[PDB]
Amino acid sequence: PQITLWKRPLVTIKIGGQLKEALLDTGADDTVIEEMSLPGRWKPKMIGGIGGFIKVRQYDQIIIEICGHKAIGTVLVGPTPVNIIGRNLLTQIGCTLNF
Amino acid sequence: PQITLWKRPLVTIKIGGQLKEALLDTGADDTVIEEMSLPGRWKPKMIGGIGGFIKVRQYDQIIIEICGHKAIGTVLVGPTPVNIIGRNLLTQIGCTLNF
Ligand SMILES: [Cl-]
Ligand SMILES: [Cl-]
């Protein structure tokens, strides 16, 4: 699709069999998703502030569907106030900025 | 242009006769630029944290050139660690996300 920027680029994603709303965020390196159940192994990471503040679970090789386009990548799962789709997944779906 | 997302979308902007590096950030509603001189009237605003923490100067009707495209809009000027081009200016240059 082509997504205009007059409103926040919030889209429906499908991840772990669940539908969620997420922000397509070219300013974010990484993808962070609210607490949820995901299968497979994960490793603990520390994010936010100076050198980590909040504990999240890093899941690799997670498939996320974004407007009918599947992306595969690393997702950090924890108590984030907003689900963020960052560049690590935007590149996977071939997303570009255009003007 | 078409800007890919393999690297942070940092671009050169021209604002107030000066060249700066700025992040094209679809996750940001507004545009914030590091301390600099700009002509005309401004009004004080409070941004960051809960209900404002850092004082900035709001300048309206500022022209910013982004990759050969002029945008006109409101710019908040203050001690930000990164220059951010937010949706208020991205829409002005006709920037869209595409996949
Ligand atoms: Cl499509
Ligand atoms: Cl062009």
UniProtKB/Swiss-Prot annotation, chains A, B:
Domain Peptidase A2 per the UniProt entry, residue ranges: 20-89
Active site: 25 (for protease activity)
Residue ranges of the region described as Dimerization of protease: 1-5, 49-55, 88-99
Disulphide connectivity of cysteines: none
Subunit structure: Homodimer, whose active site consists of two apposed aspartic acid residues.
Protein name, per record: Protease
Organism per entry: Human immunodeficiency virus type 1 group M subtype B (isolate BRU/LAI)
Parent-protein start and end of this portion: 501 to 599 of 1447
